[PDB]
Design an enzyme around this catalytic site. Structure first.
Site, mmCIF file in Angstrom:
data_model
loop_
_atom_site.group_PDB
_atom_site.id
_atom_site.type_symbol
_atom_site.label_atom_id
_atom_site.label_comp_id
_atom_site.label_asym_id
_atom_site.label_seq_id
_atom_site.Cartn_x
_atom_site.Cartn_y
_atom_site.Cartn_z
ATOM 1 N N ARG A 57 0.935 -1.039 -0.180
ATOM 2 C CA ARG A 57 -0.068 -0.049 -0.023
ATOM 3 C C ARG A 57 0.933 1.278 -0.260
ATOM 4 O O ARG A 57 1.817 1.200 0.813
ATOM 5 C CB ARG A 57 -1.027 0.072 1.252
ATOM 6 N N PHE A 62 2.441 10.509 1.836
ATOM 7 C CA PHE A 62 1.709 10.279 3.090
ATOM 8 C C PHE A 62 2.736 8.788 3.707
ATOM 9 O O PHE A 62 3.354 9.373 4.468
ATOM 10 C CB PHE A 62 0.142 9.712 2.839
ATOM 11 N N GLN A 65 3.627 1.347 2.996
ATOM 12 C CA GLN A 65 3.319 0.180 4.235
ATOM 13 C C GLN A 65 3.701 -1.197 3.610
ATOM 14 O O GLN A 65 3.344 -1.495 2.459
ATOM 15 C CB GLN A 65 1.989 0.290 4.569
ATOM 16 N N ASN A 103 -1.404 -1.497 12.723
ATOM 17 C CA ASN A 103 -2.197 -2.332 13.606
ATOM 18 C C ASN A 103 -3.769 -2.574 13.173
ATOM 19 O O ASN A 103 -3.998 -1.847 12.070
ATOM 20 C CB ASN A 103 -2.024 -1.785 14.968
ATOM 21 N N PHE A 114 4.974 0.840 8.521
ATOM 22 C CA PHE A 114 4.903 1.881 7.555
ATOM 23 C C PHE A 114 5.899 2.904 7.910
ATOM 24 O O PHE A 114 6.423 3.131 8.898
ATOM 25 C CB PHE A 114 3.442 2.544 7.253
ATOM 26 N N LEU A 123 -2.036 9.904 13.908
ATOM 27 C CA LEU A 123 -1.612 8.664 14.094
ATOM 28 C C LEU A 123 -0.875 8.526 15.554
ATOM 29 O O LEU A 123 -0.737 7.422 16.111
ATOM 30 C CB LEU A 123 -0.519 7.869 13.014
ATOM 31 N N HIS A 127 -0.224 4.363 17.207
ATOM 32 C CA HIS A 127 0.782 3.577 16.566
ATOM 33 C C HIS A 127 2.110 3.680 17.088
ATOM 34 O O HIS A 127 2.413 4.864 17.369
ATOM 35 C CB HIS A 127 1.062 4.083 14.810
#
Length: 166
Positions: A57, A62, A65, A103, A114, A123, A127
């Site tokens: 991904r 951004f 991942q 997660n 990521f 986040l 995370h």
């Protein structure tokens, strides 16, 4: 800033063409259990790990991942401690170039992670940030700009062709 105590490399290909090495510096004094998982998965010493896995991904500006070495789609992966392990420290904030555990909600770290390339303050607290990029932000950028399809899957495979602990 958190101290870097260990480093892992990823040699990355896109569509089987080499695009460079990312070196991640790891915060082993703040999150030693999370750093041990990521080192052991990079070395593959338990028989499974990141070599051969993909960045499934990728979202321009951004994050990238990866780490799903079981299902290659975001549904999988496992830690060296079991399917999941608990959140070790949520106090370190994200920042550009942060490496953090993906997660499925609280206490659900596995092998997925990521690397950010832009602020991701929403986040924070949710995370576990456990390292940062210390070489090859330009390689992360190449991956970040690769053409994607459904659910931001790269059209060409972005593969961790080799990886290990420095």
């Amino acid at each position: 800033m958190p101290v870097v105590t260990d480093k892992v490399y990823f040699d990355i290909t896109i569509g089987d063409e080499p695009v460079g090495r990312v070196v991640i510096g790891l915060f082993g004094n703040d999150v030693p259990k999370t750093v041990e998982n990521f080192k052991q998965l990079a070395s593959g010493e338990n028989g499974f790990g990141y070599k051969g896995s993909i960045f499934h991904r990728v979202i321009r500006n951004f994050m990238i991942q990866g780490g799903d070495f079981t299902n290659f789609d975001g549904t999988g992966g496992k830690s060296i401690y079991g399917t999941r392990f608990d959140d070790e420290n949520l106090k370190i904030k994200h920042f550009v170039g942060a490496v953090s555990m993906a997660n499925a909600g609280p206490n659900s770290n596995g092998s997925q992670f990521f690397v950010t390339t832009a602020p991701t303050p929403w986040l924070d607290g949710r995370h576990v940030v456990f390292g940062k990029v210390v070489e090859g932000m330009d390689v992360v950028k190449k991956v970040e700009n690769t053409k994607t399809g459904l659910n931001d899957k790269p059209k060409k495979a972005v593969k961790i062709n080799d990886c290990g602990v420095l």
